[PDB]
Design an enzyme around this catalytic site. Structure first.
Site, PDB file in Angstrom:
ATOM      1  N   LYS A 186      30.423  14.311  22.451  1.00  0.00           N
ATOM      2  CA  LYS A 186      30.133  13.157  23.308  1.00  0.00           C
ATOM      3  C   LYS A 186      31.462  12.504  23.651  1.00  0.00           C
ATOM      4  O   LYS A 186      32.284  12.281  22.761  1.00  0.00           O
ATOM      5  CB  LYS A 186      29.229  12.166  22.569  1.00  0.00           C
ATOM      6  CG  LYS A 186      28.777  10.960  23.402  1.00  0.00           C
ATOM      7  CD  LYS A 186      27.659  10.216  22.679  1.00  0.00           C
ATOM      8  CE  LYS A 186      27.285   8.909  23.370  1.00  0.00           C
ATOM      9  NZ  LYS A 186      26.234   8.167  22.599  1.00  0.00           N
ATOM     10  N   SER A 222      21.871   7.345  24.665  1.00  0.00           N
ATOM     11  CA  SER A 222      23.052   7.569  25.493  1.00  0.00           C
ATOM     12  C   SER A 222      23.702   8.943  25.358  1.00  0.00           C
ATOM     13  O   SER A 222      24.553   9.301  26.172  1.00  0.00           O
ATOM     14  CB  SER A 222      24.094   6.493  25.195  1.00  0.00           C
ATOM     15  OG  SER A 222      24.432   6.498  23.817  1.00  0.00           O
ATOM     16  N   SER A 246      20.508   6.635  19.975  1.00  0.00           N
ATOM     17  CA  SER A 246      21.116   7.537  20.956  1.00  0.00           C
ATOM     18  C   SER A 246      21.332   9.013  20.629  1.00  0.00           C
ATOM     19  O   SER A 246      21.849   9.772  21.435  1.00  0.00           O
ATOM     20  CB  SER A 246      22.397   6.875  21.446  1.00  0.00           C
ATOM     21  OG  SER A 246      22.123   5.707  22.196  1.00  0.00           O
TER      22      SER A 246
END
Ligand code: GLN
Ligand code: MG
Lengths: 485, 92, 408
Positions: free
Chosen positions: A79, A154, A178
């Protein structure tokens, strides 16, 4: 693009048994991305040149039979929240576009030591704020099970890349759910370990007391393998837990006869859709057939998860994002003459819409006259929420329920309606609030969109979570579906 | 409530440029959200201690051992405005 | 009645910074003494300095404060180029030290100045205002600081001067700081309000800044603000609030027209686990506080029979006090030792810019030279020629009036 669907566990044995070489592996991974990601859009910066170079080093180590590392030759996506030394890290924001870190995050340091191969950075909601990844400044990641559906947020890129067979492992972050929510939407496995289990050093901060790095994979075993590799005390993070035991696989395979599983009635409330509700209920029956004792309990302060979470996280975020001023790095406004202007313009132009909402909310919540009624009050509610779990954990080993109230929704369907977007965090935020570990595995599909089953454990008891999740995974999973898409 | 004044006050506190239009928009959002936050009034928090840290962990200190800083070059690498080995900013 | 209160900041002589492993001592090259933590890079975390905590509580105890058991750090939020994180990590609700006090002599009377708190925090960087822009150097950012806020018990610039003089001395003895306003390792902000005797005593406030040195400015600030505070009492002024001090012109230019009151949005620092200061810990540190100035002066006068003036000069710094105590217990005459310390030795430190400890004389050799004097085998004359060298390279004095041609 041939081992592209292989598990971490099997890909490692193939490399060890020399059935394939690290370089061929890397070649396969990039063919996959070039052929698939133009549609999925899960990756941001690719690190191909460096990836191949590392793969060359590994071929030599393979030949010389000196293949060390828990993830030797295994491809990984990270990420763009997690700092990668020398590789552009943007948090999917204009504010950090072009930002090249001059230090390495602890998880990457640990992953590089295990000889995993960095393939690139994954897309996410800007500064990790959202539930669909749609706020990304660069591109909108899509759900592999239905290109019109969001991949979640996210860590949408982290879940999508894994679900679309681009990498057998990815790293995401979970502040309010997330990792788990995107894992649920994209039908994969995602674990947000215990707060303190994984170092936050090198994790661009969202909410310091809630943030936690974790892995996403296509199966339970691999996930436990990745967790063992990134967990551990870290001198660079004073809040990393001094827990020596990072063995999360030793319990995988053992049965769950007599395992006491709690089913909170609030986790099947009115906010939960019928298909999701029905899927988790069948999962409960599947758990009983495996010998587990599933009984209903109550976590009365569940309804306050979303409100308090949003107040606390935005408040912390309003302070954690204050370093972004364009003076030492990141976006620097040009048409700025005043110092007040340098701050205000760089921030208003570098930050997306949602980020600014969180900042306004947090700034307000911590401001004079409102501090006690909002922030401190919410901190008290957090205590109640944690108390719910401690009472339940006095008699049960684990808690189960749905990961999200619904299946993945459509792109453009909730991005302009905040309160509706927030509601998707109903079942995930209580876990961050209490600092507990939580894993999500698929337990069904509705209209083709996966439904996530969530297992919440006691602090530092991820081994038990992996034990029960695996058992459930033998009864139902999507292992054979990813290949079809 | 949530007035244009409060919104502007917040904007200045968070150092965010807010246009005489986004104010009325941030106001509705700030109101809608904060109202949505009042659900916590139903939470019986009277007498409960606030949670600052979820993990009981005490005295994690670092030995006072200095480590040489990074080269000035590195420290300035990602900055856009630099001069004389220092960060350049307006004077207000 | 003139109610004053001082706000002091002290720089700790630690090897590394407060929340970062960076050196607390930097060079001339700007931004050469930083790391990703001092640069507030995204993703970095604070790591508290163990020694800074001990020293902080050491200073707090030397000031007779009650030490906290549970003590955490809080973020003091505010934007400014020398505060990269946009927040200074400090202490709000649970300062490491509370309610101490310092006694001082005023007009032949002993007055007690209470001290509200001693808390830990980090220093900001420096912005060199030059041209149409400012250049920011972060080598100093993160350096350990302790803020010592006096209770509003001082009643005049006379006492306030005496307050920070006693304070400076006690902190110097703890060894945690050099506390020299000249070098910045010691700073002070005042808070003055006038009002007739027998009131709620709310004569507003006057947070005045730019006070740079004891004997210097801050010593003349009050002379002026009271002055104004009184001459303006024939109206009931806008109270005013915060004013800077102009040096040469010397007076309070009421600098800023408050916005209202800066909201720092203080909140407990989630990145730092709370401190739990156990009794063993306190005691361990409590045991590092040496014998303080007042105690030593009392002994020098009442026990060694030394003149009060001598006692005062000898205890201005712990180093000279220690050297004096060792030298005499080495046989040397008390008065002759005081004379050489206040005289020759001190002359040396001045016209050489060197700390008594960096030189080469020792309580032993000095005691040796002193004996060669009170014996007669060395006149005050030869003594003046031998001491210089004995200081720099010496070791034996009855070896230099030898290894040299100045003999007995
Ligand atoms: N970062 C994630 O844990 C997201 C939490 C939540 N959905 C948000 O927008 O704050
Ligand atoms: Mg201060």
């Amino acid at each position: 693009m041939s081992i592209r669907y292989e598990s971490v566990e099997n890909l490692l044995t193939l490399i060890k048994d020399k059935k394939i070489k690290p370089s061929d592996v890397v070649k396969d991974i990039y063919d996959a991305i070039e052929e698939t990601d133009p549609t999925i859009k899960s990756f941001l910066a690719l690190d191909k040149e460096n990836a191949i170079k590392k793969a060359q080093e590994l071929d030599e180590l393979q030949a010389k039979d000196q293949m060390d590392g828990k993830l030797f030759g295994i491809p990984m996506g990270i990420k763009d929240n997690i700092i990668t030394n020398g590789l552009e890290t943007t948090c999917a924001s204009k504010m950090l576009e072009g930002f090249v870190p001059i230090y390495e995050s602890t998880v990457m340091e640990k992953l590089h030591k295990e000889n995993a191969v960095l393939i690139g950075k994954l897309n996410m909601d800007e500064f990790a704020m959202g539930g669909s990844t749609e706020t990304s400044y660069f591109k909108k990641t899509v759900n592999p099970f239905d290109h019109k559906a969001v991949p979640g947020g996210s860590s949408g890129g982290s879940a999508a890349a894994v679900a679309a067979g681009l990498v057998p492992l990815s790293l995401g972050s979970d502040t309010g759910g997330s990792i788990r929510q995107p894992a649920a939407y994209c039908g994969v496995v995602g674990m947000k370990p215990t707060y303190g289990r994984v170092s936050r050093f090198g994790l661009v901060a969202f909410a310091s007391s809630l943030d936690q790095i974790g892995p996403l994979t296509r199966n339970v075993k691999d996930n436990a393998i990745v967790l063992e590799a990134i967990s551990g005390a870290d001198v660079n993070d004073s809040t990393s837990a001094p827990v020596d035991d990072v063995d999360f696989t030793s319990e995988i395979g053992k049965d769950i006869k007599g395992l006491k599983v709690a089913l909170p009635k609030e986790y099947l409330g009115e906010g939960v859709a019928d298909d999701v509700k029905e899927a988790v209920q069948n999962a409960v029956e599947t758990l009983k057939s495996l010998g587990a004792v599933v009984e209903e309990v109550s976590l009365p302060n569940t309804k306050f998860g979303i409100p308090s979470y949003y107040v606390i996280a935005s408040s912390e975020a309003s302070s954690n994002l204050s370093r972004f001023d364009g003076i030492r790095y990141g976006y620097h406004s040009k048409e700025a003459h005043s110092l007040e202007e340098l701050y205000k313009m760089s921030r208003s132009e570098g930050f997306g819409k949602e980020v600014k909402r969180r900042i306004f909310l947090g700034t307000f919540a911590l401001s004079s006259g409102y501090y006690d009624a909002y922030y401190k009050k919410s901190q008290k509610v957090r205590t109640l929420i944690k108390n719910d779990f401690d009472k339940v954990f006095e008699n049960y080993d684990v808690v189960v329920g749905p990961t999200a109230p619904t299946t993945a929704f459509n792109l453009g369907e909730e991005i302009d309606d905040p309160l509706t977007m927030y509601a998707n965090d109903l079942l995930t935020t209580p876990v961050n609030l209490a600092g507990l570990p939580g894993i999500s595995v698929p337990c069904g599909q509705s209209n083709g969109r996966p439904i996530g089953l969530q297992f919440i454990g006691k602090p530092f008891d991820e081994k038990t979570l992996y034990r029960v999740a695996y058992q459930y995974e033998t009864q139902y999973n999507l292992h054979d579906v990813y290949e079809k898409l | 409530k949530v007035t244009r004044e409060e919104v502007e006050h917040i904007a200045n506190l968070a150092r965010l440029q807010i246009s005489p239009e986004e104010t009325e928009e941030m106001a509705n959002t700030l109101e809608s959200i904060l109202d949505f936050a009042k659900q916590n009034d139903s939470a019986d928090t009277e007498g409960v201690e606030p949670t600052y840290h979820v993990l009981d962990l005490q005295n994690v200190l670092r030995e006072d051992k200095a480590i040489k800083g990074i080269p000035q070059e590195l420290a300035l690498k990602n900055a856009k405005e630099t001069e004389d080995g220092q960060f350049k900013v307006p004077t207000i | 009645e003139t109610v004053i209160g001082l706000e002091v900041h002290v720089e700790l002589k630690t090897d590394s910074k407060m929340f970062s492993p960076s050196p607390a001592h930097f060079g001339a090259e700007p931004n050469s003494n930083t790391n990703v933590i001092d640069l507030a890079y995204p993703g970095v975390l604070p790591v508290v300095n163990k020694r800074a905590v001990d020293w902080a509580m050491r200073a707090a105890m030397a000031l007779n404060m009650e030490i906290a058991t549970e003590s955490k750090f809080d973020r003091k939020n505010y934007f400014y180029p020398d505060n990269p994180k946009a927040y200074q990590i400090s202490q709000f609700d649970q300062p490491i030290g509370e309610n101490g006090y310092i006694d001082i002599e005023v007009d032949g009377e002993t007055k007690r100045i209470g001290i509200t708190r001693l808390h830990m925090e980090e220093d900001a960087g420096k912005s060199t205002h030059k041209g149409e822009y400012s250049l920011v150097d972060l080598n100093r950012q993160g350096t350990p600081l302790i803020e010592i806020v006096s209770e509003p018990d001082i009643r005049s610039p006379k006492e306030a001067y005496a307050y920070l003089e006693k304070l400076r001395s006690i902190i110097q003895y703890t060894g945690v700081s050099d506390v020299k306003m000249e070098e910045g390792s010691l700073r002070c902000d005042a808070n003055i309000s006038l009002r007739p005797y027998g009131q709620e005593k709310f004569g507003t406030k006057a947070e005045l800044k730019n006070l740079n040195s004891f004997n210097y400015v801050r010593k003349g600030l009050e002379y002026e603000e009271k002055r104004q505070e009184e001459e303006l009492l024939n109206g009931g002024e806008i109270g005013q609030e915060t004013r800077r001090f102009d040096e040469s012109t010397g007076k309070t230019i009421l600098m800023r027209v408050k916005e209202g009151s800066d909201d720092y949005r203080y909140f407990p620092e989630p990145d730092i686990v709370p401190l739990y200061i156990d009794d063993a810990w306190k005691e361990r540190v409590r045991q590092t506080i040496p014998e303080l100035p007042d105690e030593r002066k009392a002994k020098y006068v009442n026990e060694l029979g030394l003149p009060a003036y001598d006692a005062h000069v000898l205890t201005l710094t712990k180093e000279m006090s220690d050297f004096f105590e060792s030298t005499i217990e080495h046989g040397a005459d008390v008065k002759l030792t005081s004379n050489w310390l206040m005289g020759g030795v001190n002359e040396y430190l001045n016209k050489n810019q060197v700390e008594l400890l960096d030189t080469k004389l020792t309580p032993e050799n000095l005691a040796g030279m002193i004996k060669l004097i009170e014996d007669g085998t060395m006149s005050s004359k030869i003594a003046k020629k031998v001491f210089p060298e004995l200081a720099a390279k010496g070791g034996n004095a009855k070896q230099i009036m030898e290894d040299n041609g100045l003999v007995q």
